[PDB]
Amino acid sequence: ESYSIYVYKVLKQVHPDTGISSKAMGIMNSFVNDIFERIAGEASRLAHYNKRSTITSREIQTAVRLLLPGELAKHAVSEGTKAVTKYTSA
């Protein structure tokens, strides 16, 4: 089990005509984990700081706000908040 099929679905979504090599897929599959830890780790420490034991969507939001710089946070805060409202109103 890896992200090499779901990242490939994104690759065939934006710029679908181009491909990728097997080595770069080794990088990308690593890269998403580099995004996966530092946001979810710092959010978990956000649960440890202000006397909590629940990680809701508000924790990951300020975790992206604390980690991603500038507009890379300001556009990722509009991507997950759009997705959680679509998930709640299924």
Partner 1 sequence: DNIQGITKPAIRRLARRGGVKRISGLIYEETRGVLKVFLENVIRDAVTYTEHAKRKTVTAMDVVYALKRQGRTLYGFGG
Partner 2 sequence: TRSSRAGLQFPVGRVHRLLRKGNYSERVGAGAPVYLAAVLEYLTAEILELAGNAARDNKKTRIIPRHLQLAIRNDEELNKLLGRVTIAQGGVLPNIQ
Of residues 7-36, which lie at the interface with DNA (CB under 7 A)? 8, 12, 19-22
Q: How far apart are CA 8 and CA 36, in angstroms?
A: 17
Q: Could you give the string, one character per residue 48-87, with x where binding to partner 1 holds by CB under 8 A and - elsewhere?
A: -xx-------xx--x--xx---------------------
68 binds partner 2 (CB under 8 A): yes
Q: How far apart are CA 19 and CA 64, in angstroms?
A: 29
Closer Cβ to DNA, 15 or 70, answer by number: 15
Q: How far apart are CA 42 and CA 48, in angstroms?
A: 10
